[PDB]
Structure formats: structure tokens, C-alpha cells
RNA sequence: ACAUCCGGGGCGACACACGUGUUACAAUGGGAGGGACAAAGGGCAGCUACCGGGCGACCGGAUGCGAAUCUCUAAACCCUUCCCCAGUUCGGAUCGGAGUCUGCAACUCGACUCCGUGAAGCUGGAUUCGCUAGUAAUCGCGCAUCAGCCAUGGCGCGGUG
């Protein structure tokens, strides 16, 4: 069968379809090691499976859109955590202990008029 | 005028002898800032 | 510079005056305000008084001036 | 704020050190510098120890104890922060080819108990012991 | 040695050719490509044939060294003696490419 | 004349121009060793526009 | 004539002083080759699919789109390699040459492109300013005015953090 989930982080959106299998994580019709050629990014994406010892037990298909690499990896991690919670509701405390299921609401602040940036001000003198 | 003196020392007087009345005021400020 | 497809920019009235003087064979001074006009080979040997804002600076065109604008020889600002 | 475990060692102290090391938000560059420095450390002092153990011992060696605000005790978090900042700052000040090489040299020196960071710590200790009466 | 110029003997071709007056990075790359010498070869490693090819490409084009110096000096002298705006700006020592003074040199 | 004070190794050497096919032989103090040695405006206007 | 039309100048001059900024002084860097990820916003004489010419700015045919439909949009990042501490493969000011566009017209006084030249600058005293989390720092993208543009300014957007 299929388990559907969605994660969000900044401008990145991840839609994750999870199914029974062994190890195939396919992102945008690409392998995980080819889409994310960074050990840190791969670890971020595959964090909840390693925490719940559910690795080597599923196939995941991910559709990511928007943002950069870190935002996309965090969104994918959130989506995988939500899918795991949907599959088994008893792992919610374990995932909460690490915070994989909390939606981080931090976004880029709007630039304000009369200022070079959101908070940085001009040199008064 | 305005002394630099790290922190500002500004004064302004309006008269025909402003260049001296301002100096009197600034002398008062400098003495008060001495200690 | 100016695109080569458009050719050089030369004031038509000023050029007509210069060729009229060439055909006549006489010598005189041509008073002009066309500071942006390019100097052509037909301009060599004449005297052209170019306006600079408040007077007419006279220029005697030589062969090394061909291809330069007329305003490069009539400075507009006075400094001392 | 939350601190991510280090990808290689699973430590928060490593991530904090990289955060101190980072310029302009280039965390990948800072991580590469730190891992490289550990590599020269393990290739040079190859010592019946580990690569991260030497770094931890160096931080513990160059950490200070008391700080004159009159002397007073130091919180553990400020102690760790000042130790990391001192190590990085003197590594930057010292000469060398690459930042990884400079950091590895300073880590080795701090472990071997001599260096600019240790000199700074000893000077702070002397300035602290100078004012024992007002304490 | 090459055009009367001794190059850095331990540098690659595409950098060491820029030490000649009249050749930059782009001209060095183009010269090496037209002569058929790989640009990542040290000067000391150039064969006699390769040095001859480079010298012959430098000749027949690429006005360099004393010829370029004399040409530039002649151009500057002509510009100054024509008495144009740029000529007087060069004679007096002020910017002549539209830059505004009173704030910067 | 004074033996020893004068520089030694005054062998005969050949100077060869690599770009002029010129070979010379001398006794420069440096079977000859080989040393390789290397050795208007109107017209422009008419060309642009005419 | 302190009213009014026009052409040519000036508002762009420089002994210098002050303020606000942009680049740098490099190894946490600079080149060369390859791989990947945004959001907002604009578009009718405008953006242009796709071909052909030019090293390039651009030019010539042709297509779709008054547009969630057709077009304009990445760089920091990652991988391989060189430079190995130098006024250098750092820096890119100044000046010389040749061009492309806009416009009746680019001299004073435009933007961009291609060659060449390649300066001061080795992290800056007294002093002084900003900020407290998706913030500072750093990276690129877009818009207003607008024939063109001196836009490094103003107003916004997202990336890494």
C-alpha cells in the first residue's frame, strides 16, 4: 500500500509516499546519493528512520519543490516523520523526544522601508 | 558650534555677540563636565 | 562610438557651406554651433569658429583632426 | 537554540566549535576545515589516543577557571565558549599555510601544554591571583 | 629570451606569457592554442620546436614590447599635440573618461 | 701569463642562434659546449566610411 | 520684462574638507571544467521558443504570449584540478585601441562588449556606528522612474546561516 505525508520548511515542500520494501529512497526520479551528495544532508533526511530503527524496511518516494538544500532536507525529514507516525501511532513519543515532528515556523522576515534590511539600520552619525 | 570632545558639546545663542555668548555657555558646560 | 552601419554624423548644412567654400576657392571663417559634428576630410584647410557657450573659438582644421568632433577643440569651461 | 549533532561524530560540542569557526554562514566550509584539521592531527600525533580525544583534552587544558569581573567563578557554558573562542582566535593569529594546518598545529600545541592559548590562560590566572584580597 | 624577455622559468605557459608587454591572460591562452602548445606546461619544459612555434605565433601579429611601447608613446604624443580636450586633460593630469573630480583623484 | 690567477676552464664554446641558423665557435669561458640564444587619420576615416 | 520661443553652454569645473556607500588588501581565497537547488516580480513594440551570423555586446529570419497557458530567474553550494604566501594566477583604478546599441545628436556628458596597460592597497590610531534569530553576516534575483542610462542609490524576494 501507500502512506502519504507532507513536510514543510521555509520555502521547501516535500510530499512523501512510503511503502513496504528495503531501502530505495528516490527523490525527484533520482537516487538519494545523487540528489544529495552530502553526508550531512543524507543523515538529515534519513534521521527519523535511524532513530526509530525503521531503516532497511521501507521504500520512500519524495517530491521536493522550492527552497534550498537544507530547507528541502528538513522538509523531507518532517514528512518522513509524519508518515512514520501515521503508519504506527506508538512511535509518536519517540519522535517527539527528538523533535522530528515539530513544524518549524521560521521564515524570512520582510524588509522594512527606510532600512537596508529587515533589522539592520543605516549608519546614523 | 559643536565641540567633538568624544561626546558632543553643543550650544546656540541668538544675539549680536553670539560668538561670545555661546563661548560663555560652553565654558559653563566644560566646567560642569570637568568633574 | 557611433555604429558603423549609420555612417558618420556630419552636419549637412555645415558640410554644404564647407563644400561651397571649396568650390568657390575663397578663404573665410565659418561660424557654427554644431559642436557634435564630426570633422571630415573635406574640412581640412578651413577656419571654423565653433560656439562654446558665450564665444566662437576658431579652429584651423588639420589632417590629424579628422575623425574628431568639432567640440573637442572648443572648450566650454574656464579654470585658472 | 537547538544544536544538530555532528554528522560524523554525533556531538554537539563539535557543532558548536564549527559554529564558532564559521564565516558568513559557510558551515560546509567550516566543517571541512574542522575535519581536515583533525586529519592532520591524527596523521601527526600518530599516541595511544584518538583524534577527537586530543581535541577535547586541548580544550580542557586551555580552559580558564576564574575571571576578574574582583575575581569570581565562571559558569560552565561561558568557560566552554571562551575556551573554543580562544583556540580559534589564536589559531587564526598564528602563521601557517592553510587554516586546517594552523588549527591542527594549535590543537597539538595545546595538548602538549604550550602555546599562545595556554599563555593567555596562564596570564588570566596570574591576573586573577593578583587580587585575592578583594574576593 | 622569447622576444628579448626572460620569463619565469617555473610557471605555466598561460600565466608566464603574460609577463611580456602586450600579452594578457586572454592573449596568452589564444597564442598557446594557435601554436598548439598545451597551456599547462611549465616554461622550462617547452621543447625547442614548441618555443619556435610560440615565437613565430608572437611574430606576425601581436605587436609587443618595444614596438607597442613606441606605438603608445606616439599615440599619446599625437593626442597631446593635437590640442583636443583629452589632450589638455592628459597634459594637465586629470581624468578624461567622464569621471568627476572634487571627490576622488 | 700568471698561472693560476687567470680563470680556468677556458674551454672552446659554440654560440648557436636557435632562430637564425647561425653557429659560431670561440673560447668563451662558460667538443664545444652549446649555448642556445634567441638572436593616418584620413586613411582611417576613409576605411571606416569612405 | 522678474513674462515668452529657440540654439549652444551649465547644473558633470577642482587647491581641497565633511557625510554616505561600493570594491579590495586574498588560502575560510583566485582561476578552469562538470553537477544541483528559490521566491517574488515584469512583459505589446515588450518578453521572446527555434534557427543563421559574430569571440562578445548584439544583428537577421521566425514562433507563442496582454499571458497560473507563451517568455524573462540564480549565485553562494558540491565534485575534480592548478596556484603555495609573493604586491602573486590577489586588486582592477587610470590610460591607449577597436566596436555594439539607444537617440536628430554620446566632445563637454551615456551604457555595454573585446584586446592591451596594468596603479594605491599587506586589515587601518584617537574615535565612532548598527544589530540580539531565520536576526547579524554573506549570496544572487526582480521592480519603480525609463528612448538610453552614470542603478555601487531606493523599494522588494528568496538561498546559506
UniProtKB/Swiss-Prot annotation, chain A:
Q: Which GO terms describe its biological process?
A: translation
So which domain of life are we looking at?
A: Bacteria
Q: Does the keyword Transcription apply?
A: no
Q: Which residues form a coiled coil?
A: none
Which Pfam families is this protein grouped with? Answer: Ribosomal_S9
What keywords is this UniProt entry annotated with?
A: Ribonucleoprotein, Ribosomal protein
InterPro entries recorded for this chain? Ribosomal_Su5_D2-typ_SF, Ribosomal_uS9, Ribosomal_uS9_bac/plastid, Ribosomal_uS9_CS, Ribsml_uS5_D2-typ_fold_subgr
Q: Where is the composition biased (Basic residues)?
A: 112-125
The ranges of region (Disordered) come to 105-125
List the GO cellular component terms.
cytosolic small ribosomal subunit
What's one GO MF term for it? RNA binding
Q: Which family does it belong to?
A: Belongs to the universal ribosomal protein uS9 family.
What the entry lists under HAMAP family is as follows: Ribosomal_uS9_B
Q: Any idea what this protein is called?
A: Small ribosomal subunit protein uS9
This protein's gene is called: rpsI
From Swiss-Prot, chain C:
Tell me the function of this protein: Protein S19 forms a complex with S13 that binds strongly to the 16S ribosomal RNA.
Q: Which organism is it from?
A: Porphyromonas gingivalis (strain ATCC 33277 / DSM 20709 / CIP 103683 / JCM 12257 / NCTC 11834 / 2561)
Q: Which family does it belong to?
A: Belongs to the universal ribosomal protein uS19 family.
Q: Which Pfam families match?
A: Ribosomal_S19
Among the GO molecular function terms of this UniProt record, one is: structural constituent of ribosome
Return the protein name.
Small ribosomal subunit protein uS19
Q: Does the keyword Zinc-finger apply?
A: no
Domain of life the protein comes from = Bacteria
Q: Give disulfide pairs as residue numbers.
A: none
Q: Which GO terms describe its biological process?
A: ribosomal small subunit assembly; translation
State the GO CC annotations. Answer: cytoplasm; small ribosomal subunit
Gene for this chain: rpsS
The answer on whether this UniProt entry bears the keyword rRNA-binding reads yes
List the residue ranges forming a coiled coil, or say none: none
Keywords from the UniProt entry: Ribonucleoprotein, Ribosomal protein, RNA-binding, rRNA-binding
From Swiss-Prot, chain E:
Q: Name one GO molecular function term.
A: rRNA binding
The GO annotation for biological process reads: translation
Which keywords annotate this record?
Answer: Ribonucleoprotein, Ribosomal protein, RNA-binding, rRNA-binding, tRNA-binding
One Gene Ontology cellular component annotation held by this UniProt entry: small ribosomal subunit
Quaternary structure (record)? Part of the 30S ribosomal subunit. Forms a loose heterodimer with protein S19. Forms two bridges to the 50S subunit in the 70S ribosome.
Q: Which family does it belong to?
A: Belongs to the universal ribosomal protein uS13 family.
Q: What does the UniProt record say this protein does?
A: Located at the top of the head of the 30S subunit, it contacts several helices of the 16S rRNA. In the 70S ribosome it contacts the 23S rRNA (bridge B1a) and protein L5 of the 50S subunit (bridge B1b), connecting the 2 subunits; these bridges are implicated in subunit movement. Contacts the tRNAs in the A and P-sites.
Q: In its UniProt entry, what is this protein called?
A: Small ribosomal subunit protein uS13
* Gene designation: rpsM
- Quote the range of the complete protein represented: 4 to 108 of 126
UniProtKB/Swiss-Prot annotation, chain F:
Which keywords label this protein?
A: Ribonucleoprotein, Ribosomal protein
Query: Does Lipid metabolism count among this protein's keywords?
Result: no
InterPro entries from the xrefs? Ribosomal_bL28/bL31-like_sf (IPR034704), Ribosomal_bL31 (IPR002150), Ribosomal_bL31_B (IPR027493), Ribosomal_bL31_sf (IPR042105)
PROSITE patterns (UniProt xref): RIBOSOMAL_L31
Q: Which GO terms describe its biological process?
A: translation
This protein's record includes keyword Membrane: no
One GO location term (cellular component): ribonucleoprotein complex
Q: Name one GO molecular function term.
A: structural constituent of ribosome
User: Do you know which Pfam families this protein is assigned to?
Assistant: Ribosomal_L31 (PF01197)
Which family would the database say this protein is a member of? Belongs to the bacterial ribosomal protein bL31 family. Type B subfamily.
> Which NCBIfam families does the protein's record reference?
L31 (TIGR00105), PRK01678.1 (NF002462)
Q: What is this protein called?
A: Large ribosomal subunit protein bL31B
Amino acid at each position: 500500500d501507500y502512506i502519504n505525508a507532507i513536510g514543510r520548511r521555509k520555502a521547501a515542500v516535500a510530499r512523501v509516499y512510503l511503502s513496504e520494501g528495503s531501502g530505495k529512497i528516490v527523490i525527484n526520479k533520482r537516487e538519494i546519493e545523487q540528489y544529495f551528495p552530502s553526508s550531512i544532508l543524507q543523515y538529515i533526511v534519513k534521521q527519523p528512520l535511524l532513530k526509530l530503527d525503521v531503516a532497511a524496511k521501507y521504500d520512500i518516494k519524495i517530491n521536493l519543490r522550492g527552497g534550498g538544500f537544507k530547507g528541502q532536507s528538513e522538509a523531507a525529514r518532517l514528512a518522513i516523520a509524519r508518515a512514520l507516525v501515521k503508519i504506527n501511532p506508538d512511535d509518536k513519543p519517540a519522535l517527539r523526544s527528538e523533535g522530528f515532528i515539530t513544524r518549524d515556523p521560521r521564515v524570512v522576515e520582510r524588509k522594512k522601508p527606510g532600512r537596508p534590511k529587515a533589522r539592520k539600520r543605516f549608519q546614523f552619525s | 558650534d559643536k565641540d567633538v570632545a568624544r561626546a558632543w558639546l553643543f550650544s546656540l545663542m541668538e544675539a549680536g555677540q553670539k560668538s561670545s555668548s555661546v563661548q560663555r555657555r560652553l565654558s559653563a558646560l566644560k566646567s560642569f563636565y570637568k568633574y | 562610438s557611433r555604429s558603423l552601419k549609420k555612417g558618420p554624423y556630419i552636419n549637412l548644412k555645415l558640410e554644404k557651406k564647407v563644400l561651397a567654400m571649396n568650390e568657390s576657392g575663397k578663404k573665410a571663417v565659418i561660424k557654427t554651433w554644431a559642436r557634435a559634428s564630426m570633422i571630415s576630410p573635406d574640412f581640412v584647410g578651413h577656419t571654423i569658429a565653433v560656439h562654446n557657450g558665450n564665444k566662437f573659438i576658431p579652429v584651423f582644421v588639420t589632417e590629424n583632426m579628422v575623425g574628431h568632433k568639432l567640440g573637442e577643440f572648443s572648450p566650454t569651461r574656464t579654470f585658472r | 537554540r537547538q544544536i544538530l549533532p555532528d554528522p560524523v561524530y554525533g556531538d554537539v560540542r563539535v557543532t558548536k566549535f564549527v559554529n564558532h569557526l564559521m564565516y558568513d554562514g559557510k558551515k560546509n566550509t567550516a566543517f571541512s576545515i574542522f575535519y581536515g584539521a583533525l586529519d592532520i592531527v591524527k596523521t601527526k600525533h600518530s599516541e595511544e589516543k584518538s583524534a577527537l580525544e586530543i581535541w577535547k583534552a586541548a580544550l580542557d587544558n586551555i580552559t580558564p577557571q576564574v575571571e576578574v569581573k574582583v575575581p569570581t567563578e565562571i559558569r560552565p557554558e561561558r568557560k566552554e565558549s571562551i575556551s573554543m573562542k580562544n583556540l580559534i582566535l589564536y589559531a587564526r593569529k598564528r602563521g601557517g599555510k592553510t587554516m586546517a594546518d594552523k588549527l591542527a598545529a594549535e590543537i597539538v600545541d595545546a595538548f602538549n601544554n604550550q602555546g599562545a592559548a595556554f599563555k593567555r590562560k596562564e596570564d588570566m590566572h596570574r591576573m586573577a591571583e593578583a587580587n585575592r584580597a578583594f574576593a | 629570451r622569447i622576444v628579448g624577455v626572460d620569463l619565469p622559468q617555473n610557471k605555466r605557459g598561460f600565466i608566464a606569457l603574460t609577463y611580456i608587454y602586450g600579452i594578457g591572460r586572454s592573449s596568452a591562452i589564444t597564442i598557446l592554442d594557435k601554436a598548439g602548445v598545451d597551456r599547462d606546461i611549465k616554461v622550462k619544459d617547452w621543447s625547442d620546436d614548441q618555443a619556435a612555434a610560440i615565437r613565430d605565433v608572437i611574430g606576425a601579429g601581436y605587436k609587443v614590447e618595444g614596438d607597442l611601447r613606441s606605438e603608445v608613446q606616439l599615440n599619446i604624443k599625437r593626442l597631446m599635440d593635437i590640442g583636443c580636450y583629452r589632450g589638455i586633460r592628459h597634459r594637465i593630469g586629470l581624468p578624461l573618461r567622464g569621471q568627476s573630480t572634487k571627490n576622488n583623484a | 701569463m700568471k698561472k693560476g690567477i687567470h680563470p680556468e676552464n677556458y674551454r672552446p664554446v659554440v654560440f648557436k642562434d636557435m632562430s637564425n641558423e647561425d653557429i659560431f665557435i670561440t673560447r668563451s669561458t662558460m667538443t664545444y659546449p652549446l649555448i642556445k640564444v634567441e638572436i593616418g587619420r584620413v586613411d582611417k576615416f576613409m576605411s571606416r566610411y569612405g
